[PDB]
Amino acid sequence: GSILYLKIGLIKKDYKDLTLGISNNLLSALSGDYDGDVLNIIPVFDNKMKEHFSLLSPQNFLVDRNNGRFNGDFDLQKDQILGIFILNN
Amino acid sequence: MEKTYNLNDILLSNEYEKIKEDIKEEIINDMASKKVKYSNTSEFAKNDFLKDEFIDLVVDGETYEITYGNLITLLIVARPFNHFKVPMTEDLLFDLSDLKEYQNYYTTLLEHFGYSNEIKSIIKDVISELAIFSGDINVTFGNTVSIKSLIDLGNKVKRFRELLHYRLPNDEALEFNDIEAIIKKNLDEIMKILSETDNMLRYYIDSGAGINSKQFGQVLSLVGSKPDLFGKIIPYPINTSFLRGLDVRSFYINALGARKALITNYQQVRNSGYLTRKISMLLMDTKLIDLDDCGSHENNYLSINVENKDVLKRFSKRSYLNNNGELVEIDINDESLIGQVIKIPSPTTCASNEGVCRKCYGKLFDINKDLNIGMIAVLLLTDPLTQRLLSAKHELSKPLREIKDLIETNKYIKDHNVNEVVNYFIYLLNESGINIQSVHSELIIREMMKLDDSDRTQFKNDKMPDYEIFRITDANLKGDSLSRSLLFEQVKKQLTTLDYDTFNKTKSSILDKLL
Amino acid sequence: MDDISVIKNEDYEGSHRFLAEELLMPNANKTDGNRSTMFCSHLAQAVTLQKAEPPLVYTNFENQVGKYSTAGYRKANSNYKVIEKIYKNDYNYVLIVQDQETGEYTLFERAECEFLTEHYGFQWDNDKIDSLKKDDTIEKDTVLYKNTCYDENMNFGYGVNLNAAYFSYKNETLEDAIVISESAAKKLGTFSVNKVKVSVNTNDILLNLYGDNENYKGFPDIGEHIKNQIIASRRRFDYNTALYELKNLNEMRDSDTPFFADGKIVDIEIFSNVPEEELKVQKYNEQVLYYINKQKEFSNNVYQKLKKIVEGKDNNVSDKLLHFYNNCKMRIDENISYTYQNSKFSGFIMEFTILEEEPLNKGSKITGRYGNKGVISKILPDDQMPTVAEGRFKGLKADICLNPLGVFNRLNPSQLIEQELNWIAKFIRKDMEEAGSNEEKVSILLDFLNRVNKEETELMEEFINSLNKTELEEFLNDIIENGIPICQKPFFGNIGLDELWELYNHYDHIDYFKCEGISTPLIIGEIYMVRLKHEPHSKFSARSTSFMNLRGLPAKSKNFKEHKDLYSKTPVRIGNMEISNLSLTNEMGSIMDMLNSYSNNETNRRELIMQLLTGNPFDTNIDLSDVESGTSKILKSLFTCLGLSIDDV
Numbered sequence A: 001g002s003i004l005y006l007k008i009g010l011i012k013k014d015y016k017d018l019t020l021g022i023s024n025n026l027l028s029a030l031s032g033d034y035d036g037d038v039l040n041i042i043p044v045f046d047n048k049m050k051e052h053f054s055l056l057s058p059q060n061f062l063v064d065r066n067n068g069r070f071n072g073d074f075d076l077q078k079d080q081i082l083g084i085f086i087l088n089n
Numbered sequence B: 001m002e003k004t005y006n007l008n009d010i011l012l013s014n015e016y017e018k019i020k021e022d023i024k025e026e027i028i029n030d031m032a033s034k035k036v037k038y039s040n041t042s043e044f045a046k047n048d049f050l051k052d053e054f055i056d057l058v059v060d061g062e063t064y065e066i067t068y069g070n071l072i073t074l075l076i077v078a079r080p081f082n083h084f085k086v087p088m089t090e091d092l093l094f095d096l097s098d099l100k101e102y103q104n105y106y107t108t109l110l111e112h113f114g115y116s117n118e119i120k121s122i123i124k125d126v127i128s129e130l131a132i133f134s135g136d137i138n139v140t141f142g143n144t145v146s147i148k149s150l151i152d153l154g155n156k157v158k159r160f161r162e163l164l165h166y167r168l169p170n171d172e173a174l175e176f177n178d179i180e181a182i183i184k185k186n187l188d189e190i191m192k193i194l195s196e197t198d199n200m201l202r203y204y205i206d207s208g209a210g211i212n213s214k215q216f217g218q219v220l221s222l223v224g225s226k227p228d229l230f231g232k233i234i235p236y237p238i239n240t241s242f243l244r245g246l247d248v249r250s251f252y253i254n255a256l257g258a259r260k261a262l263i264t265n266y267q268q269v270r271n272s273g274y275l276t277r278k279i280s281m282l283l284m285d286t287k288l289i290d291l292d293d294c295g296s297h298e299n300n301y302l303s304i305n306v307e308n309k310d311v312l313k314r315f316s317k318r319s320y321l322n323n324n325g326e327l328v329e330i331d332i333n334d335e336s337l338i339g340q341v342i343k344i345p346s347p348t349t350c351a352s353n354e355g356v357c358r359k360c361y362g363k364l365f366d367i368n369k370d371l372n373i374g375m376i377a378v379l380l381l382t383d384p385l386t387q388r389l390l391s392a393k394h395e396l397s398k399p400l401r402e403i404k405d406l407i408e409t410n411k412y413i414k415d416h417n418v419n420e421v422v423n424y425f426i427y428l429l430n431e432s433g434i435n436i437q438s439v440h441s442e443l444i445i446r447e448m449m450k451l452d453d454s455d456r457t458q459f460k461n462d463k464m465p466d467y468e469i470f471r472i473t474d475a476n477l478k479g480d481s482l483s484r485s486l487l488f489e490q491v492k493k494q495l496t497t498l499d500y501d502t503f504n505k506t507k508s509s510i511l512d513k514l515l
Numbered sequence C: 001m002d003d004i005s006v007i008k009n010e011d012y013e014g015s016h017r018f019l020a021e022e023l024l025m026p027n028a029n030k031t032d033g034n035r036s037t038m039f040c041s042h043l044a045q046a047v048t049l050q051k052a053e054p055p056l057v058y059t060n061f062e063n064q065v066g067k068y069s070t071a072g073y074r075k076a077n078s079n080y081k082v083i084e085k086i087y088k089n090d091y092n093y094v095l096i097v098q099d100q101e102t103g104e105y106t107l108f109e110r111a112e113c114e115f116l117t118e119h120y121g122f123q124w125d126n127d128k129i130d131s132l133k134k135d136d137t138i139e140k141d142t143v144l145y146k147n148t149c150y151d152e153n154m155n156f157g158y159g160v161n162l163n164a165a166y167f168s169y170k171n172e173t174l175e176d177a178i179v180i181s182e183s184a185a186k187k188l189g190t191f192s193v194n195k196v197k198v199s200v201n202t203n204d205i206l207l208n209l210y211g212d213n214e215n216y217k218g219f220p221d222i223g224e225h226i227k228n229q230i231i232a233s234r235r236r237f238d239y240n241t242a243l244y245e246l247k248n249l250n251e252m253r254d255s256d257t258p259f260f261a262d263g264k265i266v267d268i269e270i271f272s273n274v275p276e277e278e279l280k281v282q283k284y285n286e287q288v289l290y291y292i293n294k295q296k297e298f299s300n301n302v303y304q305k306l307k308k309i310v311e312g313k314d315n316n317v318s319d320k321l322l323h324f325y326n327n328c329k330m331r332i333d334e335n336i337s338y339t340y341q342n343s344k345f346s347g348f349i350m351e352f353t354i355l356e357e358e359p360l361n362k363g364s365k366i367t368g369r370y371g372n373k374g375v376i377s378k379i380l381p382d383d384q385m386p387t388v389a390e391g392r393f394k395g396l397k398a399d400i401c402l403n404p405l406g407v408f409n410r411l412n413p414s415q416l417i418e419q420e421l422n423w424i425a426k427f428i429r430k431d432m433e434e435a436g437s438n439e440e441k442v443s444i445l446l447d448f449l450n451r452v453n454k455e456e457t458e459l460m461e462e463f464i465n466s467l468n469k470t471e472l473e474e475f476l477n478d479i480i481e482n483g484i485p486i487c488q489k490p491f492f493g494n495i496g497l498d499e500l501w502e503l504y505n506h507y508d509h510i511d512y513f514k515c516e517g518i519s520t521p522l523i524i525g526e527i528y529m530v531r532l533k534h535e536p537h538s539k540f541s542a543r544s545t546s547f548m549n550l551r552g553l554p555a556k557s558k559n560f561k562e563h564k565d566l567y568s569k570t571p572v573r574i575g576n577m578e579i580s581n582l583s584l585t586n587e588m589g590s591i592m593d594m595l596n597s598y599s600n601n602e603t604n605r606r607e608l609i610m611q612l613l614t615g616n617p618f619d620t621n622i623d624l625s626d627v628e629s630g631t632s633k634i635l636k637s638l639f640t641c642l643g644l645s646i647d648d649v
């Protein structure tokens, strides 16, 4: 799953902003870091193409094709693990 | 806040999101209003945050005694019950005290709800919301770090005080193993005393996020010896510690270690991930065919001996012939299988000529019907193995090279048989430390296969035909489909010479459409 | 090795000859090698700061490296006497001076900014030189100008000190994310200079982009700012198309050539190979003619002024003087053709040098002095940021909040040392403010300095004994309003854990800062910051439909270098594992369809554009043909011409 099928949700209003926002939980699955990696985007147009690539949506990768359990790459990362620990314990 | 609730009610009621929002707002407002006091000792200061309580919950006909936070998270995760309007049952409850258990919890849900798409969507939603809630709680609770905490702890506890104030007893000659043992014991003591007592980093080390034991022990306790660029320990280990200071000779040693790390990183990046190229290029054509049973012979089932539970982990979601010979599901938790040689179905022995039957893939088949099974196998093998090899280069590396040779050089295959080679592969996988389902490995062996008659029907008879296996590049070049051969390397001899009979060879393939 | 046994601490004791780069970073005695290497690379990557300040914690070597480095100022080699001054343009001028003793003449010049390389450069603080007038003696140590890195007294400044606290913000400081306030980001202002040249032949003509009919200016003047990120444009004139395309000269046509930049015009240089008569009868070349006349007048004046010097053989001049005068004499004389890149051109070529300031862009990088790199994740109004609102320091605000995930993994406890030192300094500043009499406050000041650095304390006591009473009071005012500097040696003489232990033991009045609404009493302290160069704008290629190569396939182009494209627009290529992972899904036909529709097949891509342009914008129902792709056909040519052939099944 080093490729992801993602859906646009919001257009940034600030003209000078040129960075791509991405949720934290997708960092591990695509194996990246905010240090300066350059990632590539390919738009998709055909509706049939949308349906075919729906299998590449992160929701599909949520199931582990290895062991069939909940995927650890989508599991909570560092800071949120800490925070939930504070809440629970 | 109320002494008791009935979770079944809050999920069935329409005010579910309202109650959750109210509860979250109360937590944030309350705990933001209050303040945190550190006892800085083994004893605990009196902090009366309402986030921790002893509230009750009446569900399934029984009353559980949990805190406020457990309640909010229990409602936050039980969202599927609300969405599908299905009551919760006791077995569907887990002690949320341990975070890792949440993992298991998620998995078991995917079982009672039929592996549907909707439950996958709702799982994604609840994960996202839990992340956002952790974000707001993490602003409204501080997590700062400074060494003043350490200083005050040392003032309070003299044990930690003298522990940080320690050097190697250089009065006697010290061996490498002795210094490693002493530094290990000191690091364990540091972590133990840190966890025992209250401090501004207690939660940090209890949770474990953002703290590495090794780096911690190196920073506070003594640094310890470092290897030379060629991999030899220096005779003079660094008696000092990073916090305390350094020696000019120690400074030189540290600089040498850093330059060694930089050189290793350079060569590691230069490696370029070349093996995945050919392994994928060969394995990608493999397919799956929806058929109940290949109908292979009983002797076609390959035999494997059990030495530890690790091989049982490697052999989940599959079936073994029992005393009656019926293929019953293998149970990893089961222990009666220790020290036994038993036959298992495999793709490398499947009698389906169209592809692989669902019997060989075991119960796992239903999960994988969407995707190219072989491609998952190859990628899921090449990723952790390369990562482990590269980290080891950054001892344990030798088995990894052995695995690479077994796949590539093929001397062992030329000297032995399929059962032996697969058992060796399982043993090598265990040594390497990575864990992958054995089904994918057996599928790589199925691709590895080579026999005289392309038909698998003979395979279903009593005696199997010739079972030879060649080099990975040789095996791909062996592949009668020319489309994949041309896309490989070494095309020169393929096109201009008759050694590989590429003029003769012909077979359909996926990439054949690509041409 | 035995050499490893050879080196002894006694050999190098009380000397720093071994350490070269970390001379600029305090307290190298506690850091790791990887972090030191990172810091050395960053110091190779530092950029100019508009609001540069000298760091609070200093290692006595910043002044040295500044003084010895000679790419940031111009010190007169000896005492000279200025004989004359000339000005080329509004913002630049030159000075003709004579040596007082040697009797030799020399040139100086001024400019608003200096072009270092491509984007990078810096603005020049020319106050000192501009203050000079005619017939005034210059002195040997007088510096005509300096970069902003240098303070009033040649104090080195390569970064600025900012208030920082360790704090996790909405799970948003995960990894190396850094959040900064608006005021601090407004501080980290950095210059940038670009040089861009445009060619005008006999064919292409300019357009009156700027101003009315009377004021025909295709490019902004010196004072003007470039508008709409466009400097000028050219229309490709054709004799046949003189009836439709050339019409409406004021408005640009669709098929023209513009140029793209930003900032304000700093200087203009024109080279013309055409006779001036044509320019005289050219209305759309009035601006260039005016500039050429101005430049020619400048050259005439300089030649006239310096002729008496140059023709006098008895006079001694620098080779620079002769080179400059010969250059101007070249310019004035007629029949002087210019041949750019070893080839004559037609028309003229003109070069603009432009300067502009940038604030911090979301996504830039900032690092301390120990390699603690990061990326500016999001910026906030300062009111929406943790503040302390208790005690004497009620209302203090922290500009930036670093990532408190772990410093122990990065192996550099030195940042914490600097932070707690500066926080303690804040508290001492408050205490000495509370002091009433000068003698006792200087006593407590030197007391603390002795607790931290005794010898530097001795130097302070010598200084304060040297200072006069009123000056002394002004000094304490400067201390209370700025702060107190702390000297910290790189490797020999720095602080360790024990001195901090003693400080906290004696300083029982020290207390955690109780921030409002925040559960833990976090700590705020000054830390030095420097901004790197790696900006998100440096990798922003995005292409829709650009020039195809001879194979009818996408290919990069040279428009971006010539400033013809706003964005870089260089396409991405799909490689081995790309096709592999796309084929992880059982849709090989779909992948082939995508590849054919995007680039491979000309007919398929054309029909994609046709279908996609019209039809419902919200719903795209593409239809694909089965024409053979260009790649397959050219491979067929390869095989057939090799003697190979094609035969399916």
Ligand SMILES: [Zn+2]
Binding pocket: B293, B294, B295, B296, B346, B349, B350, B351, B352, B356, B357, B358, B359, B360
């Ligand atoms: Zn089978």
